[PDB]
Structures are given as structure tokens and as C-alpha cells.
Design an enzyme around this catalytic site. Structure first.
Site, short mmCIF file in Angstrom:
data_model
loop_
_atom_site.label_atom_id
_atom_site.label_comp_id
_atom_site.label_asym_id
_atom_site.label_seq_id
_atom_site.Cartn_x
_atom_site.Cartn_y
_atom_site.Cartn_z
CE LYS A 1 -4.06 1.93 2.39
NZ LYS A 1 -5.00 1.55 3.48
CD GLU B 1 -7.78 3.57 5.10
OE1 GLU B 1 -7.09 4.09 6.01
OE2 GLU B 1 -7.30 2.89 4.18
MG LIG Z 1 -6.68 1.06 9.27
#
Ligand SMILES: [Mg+2]
Ligand SMILES: N#Cc1ccc(COC[C@H]2O[C@@H](n3c(NCc4ccc(Cl)c(Cl)c4)nc4c(N)ncnc43)[C@H](O)[C@@H]2O)cc1
Length: 382
Positions: A71, A176
């Protein structure tokens, strides 16, 4: 066609998958009975791929061919300064290919292969998909996947591409912190509020300031520290015990990778115990040169060793407030995400910064993002 849409938090170190089934969100455990799967892929010299804990647990034995932190590279070019810095800290080989940082590994039989970061993330998503299919007892074809709020167009597209490679149609890419706010039902409220999401995970620290207006979210500012998380606190404790052992015995245990990994495992367990108690016994059978290790770590010592790092989490919070032109008193909800927010000193610092304001609690901070993604996946499944 779309069936049951899954919600996946594709994290830097850990991934988590949820579904909306029978009127509620269900976070799904994998084949090892774990509701979290490490974002790790290991390539064995037998041509097999290992994912998750199977891969993570074999890191010490296979340090060049166990891939993690993909990532950090996804959606970036090879020459991006962030990539050129990150590769200095990664043990596996990273090469320039098609302008990107491809990961190069040995797959056995004298063969080496290169994988784009989105191909490594696709292997993690395939495992998440397998986990979901075993639970549902049917195939999964569509998903909602979360990304950090700072992700740019290339990073979001590369994440949808990892889904495509894994056989998932990534219908929505959600931020997120927005997914954590959705888990807390903050999207199902009349009126307007300012939310600060403080996310301290295993390896990264993200702070986001969101506005919620009758179900509508806006990310107004982001900050944090790309290389600060729970692993850093473990490392400070490891260094502590390694130096104490060298002074006592005259032995430097760093020569033995196995001894270091046994210590890392036990230090991580002791840190967790120190979130609910004030002393923790670290016990290791045959630690170094066949000799057992038995020492105690107090919560005071754990906090002292990490005080600068814990305090450092406060400057990104102040910066997001300045970039949002908001005052501390304008914050209506503080949401804590990431497993490291369990640390009492971290909760104390956040509460102190906000002049005694209590953060939102109740949802497992390792699962809140996947939970919010699953809520949105339930809307899409119809
Ligand atoms: Mg996280
Ligand atoms: N099983 C399992 C499992 C569940 C969640 C995670 C994710 O952890 C992210 C970070 O969060 C850290 N962390 C966690 N992580 C959650 C966790 C719970 C149980 C286990 Cl066996 C493990 Cl090991 C990890 N709990 C903490 C605590 N009580 N006090 C301080 N730090 C804690 C952890 O050390 C890591 O740095 C990792 C593993």
C-alpha cells in the site's frame, strides 16, 4: 449479478472484511479464525503463494521473498520521492518497470517474477474474497474498498485495479475516516457536525477532519505521520531489552534473527497486556544460546520509552485544525481508529488535547473501517 457486496478495509499492515447479512453487519473471520488478515504475501521456492498470517509467520525464514507494505507503493511512480525513500526500508527487491515500483521475488526453480503493487494487493483482496465466500456459502463478485483520505486519483484507480485482478468489481472507493464515521451511525443524524478521526495503526498515523451535514461528508483536512504506529512502539521496547541484555551478559542478540523475532512477539504481547494492567512478564524459552529469558516491563517504562512518539501524534491534530480554520471547541466527535488507540497514554493525550472531551468509543478500532464499508455494501446489495 452484484449479489452480496463485501466491505473491505485494505490496510497497510492488516485487512478486514465485513458483509451486511440478516439485518446487521458481520465482520468475517478467516480460515485461521481471525477477524483481521495481515496484508502479507510470501513466495515459497515451491511456487506456492502464502497470504496473511501464513506469510507473516515465515518472514524471518524468508526475508527477501515476503512482501508487505505494498500500500506504500500502490498508485505511485518508481521515481516518486516517497517510493525512493520507502524502498530503503523494505527487505524485498523493488525495481523500475513500466514507470512503476514493481516488487521482484524468487518463486522457485531458478525463476524470479515481478509484480506491480496492485498485483500484490490483488493477492490480499483474493484472500479477503475467499474469506467472505466461505462465510456466505456463495460467490462474491462486488466490493466497496476503503482508502486513506489523502489517496490521489492514481492511488484510488490502482486500488480499483487490484480489485479487478482479484475478480472484484470495486463499485465504490470510500475514505477510511468516512467509513469509521459511518460505523458510528454519524451519517444517520440531522444537522451538521465536525468530526476528528484519529487513526493510529500498526504502522501509520492518520488524522482527518470531516464535516457531516445531514448524511453528506466532506474531508476538509488530513495530516499524520506515514511511519508511526504500533510497530514503532514495539521496536523502542525491543531496543531497550536488547541493550539491557548486552550490558548484563555481554551478548548482542541481534546476530540471531530468531532470537530477535521471539523477543518481538513477546514484546508485542506485553505491550497489549499493558493497556489493561501495569506490569507484564516477558518469558521466552531458549531465547539466545539456548538460555531462557524472563523479564518484566512496567507500563511506566513502556510510556517513558515511547513518550516522544506518543506526544508527536498531537502536532498533526493541531495542524488539521489550523488547515480547517477550526478551533478545538468546534470538534463535535473524536473517533479513535487503529489498534494502537487502545494505549491508555494515547487516549489520555487525545482527551488532554481536547480539554477533557471524551472520544467516541465502543466499536473495535481495528474493525470500525471495515464495519463502515460493510454498512455501505449493505445499501448496494439491495
Ligand atoms: Mg486502518
Ligand atoms: N488476532 C489479531 C489481531 C487483531 C488486530 C491487529 C491489528 O493491530 C494493529 C496494531 O494495534 C496494536 N494493538 C492491538 N491490536 C489488536 C490485537 C488484538 C489481539 C491480538 Cl492477539 C493482537 Cl496480535 C492484536 N491491541 C492493542 C492493545 N490492547 N494495546 C496496544 N496496542 C494494541 C497492535 O500491537 C498493532 O501494532 C492485529 C492482530
Amino acid at each position: 449479478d452484484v449479489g452480496t457486496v463485501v466491505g473491505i478495509d485494505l490496510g497497510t499492515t492488516y485487512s478486514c472484511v465485513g458483509v451486511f447479512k440478516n439485518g446487521r453487519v458481520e465482520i468475517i473471520a478467516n480460515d485461521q479464525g481471525n477477524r483481521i488478515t495481515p496484508s502479507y504475501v510470501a513466495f515459497t521456492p515451491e511456487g506456492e503463494r502464502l497470504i496473511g498470517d501464513a506469510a507473516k509467520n515465515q518472514l524471518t525464514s524468508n526475508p527477501e521473498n515476503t512482501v508487505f507494505d505494498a500500500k506504500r507503493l500502490i498508485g505511485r511512480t518508481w521515481n516518486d520521492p516517497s517510493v525512493q525513500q520507502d524502498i530503503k526500508f523494505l527487505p524485498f527487491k523493488v525495481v523500475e518497470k513500466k514507470t512503476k515500483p514493481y516488487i521482484q521475488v524468487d518463486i522457485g526453480g531458478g525463476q524470479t517474477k515481478t509484480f506491480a503493487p496492485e498485483e500484490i494487493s490483488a493477492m490480499v483482496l483474493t484472500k479477503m474474497k475467499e474469506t467472505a465466500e466461505a462465510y456466505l456459502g456463495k460467490k462474491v463478485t462486488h466490493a466497496v474498498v476503503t482508502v486513506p483520505a489523502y489517496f490521489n486519483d492514481a492511488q484510488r484507480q490502482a486500488t480499483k485495479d487490484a480489485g479487478t485482478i482479484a475478480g472484484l468489481n470495486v463499485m465504490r472507493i470510500i475514505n477510511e475516516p468516512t467509513a469509521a464515521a459511518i460505523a458510528y451511525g454519524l451519517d444517520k443524524r440531522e444537522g451538521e457536525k465536525n468530526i476528528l478521526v484519529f487513526d493510529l495503526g500498526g504502522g501509520t498515523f492518520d488524522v482527518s477532519l470531516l464535516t457531516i451535514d445531514n448524511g453528506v461528508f466532506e474531508v476538509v483536512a488530513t495530516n499524520g505521520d506515514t511511519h508511526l504506529g504500533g510497530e514503532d512502539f514495539d521496536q523502542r521496547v525491543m531496543e531497550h531489552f536488547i541493550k539491557l541484555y548486552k550490558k548484563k551478559t555481554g551478548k548482542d542478540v541481534r546476530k540471531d534473527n530468531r532470537a530477535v523475532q521471539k523477543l518481538r512477539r513477546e514484546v508485542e504481547k506485553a505491550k497489549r497486556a499493558l493497556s489493561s494492567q501495569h506490569q507484564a512478564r516477558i518469558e521466552i524459552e531458549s531465547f539466545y544460546e539456548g538460555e531462557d529469558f524472563s523479564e518484566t516491563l512496567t507500563r511506566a517504562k513502556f510510556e517513558e520509552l515511547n513518550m516522544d512518539l506518543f506526544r508527536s501524534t498531537m502536532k498533526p491534530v493541531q495542524k488539521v485544525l489550523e488547515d480547517s480554520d477550526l478551533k478545538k471547541s468546534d470538534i463535535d466527535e473524536i473517533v479513535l481508529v487503529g489498534g494502537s488507540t487502545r494505549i491508555p497514554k494515547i487516549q489520555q493525550l487525545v482527551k488532554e488535547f481536547f480539554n477533557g472531551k471524551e472520544p467516541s468509543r465502543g466499536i473495535n478500532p481495528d474493525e470500525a473501517v471495515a464495519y463502515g464499508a460493510a454498512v455501505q455494501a449493505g445499501v448496494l446489495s439491495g
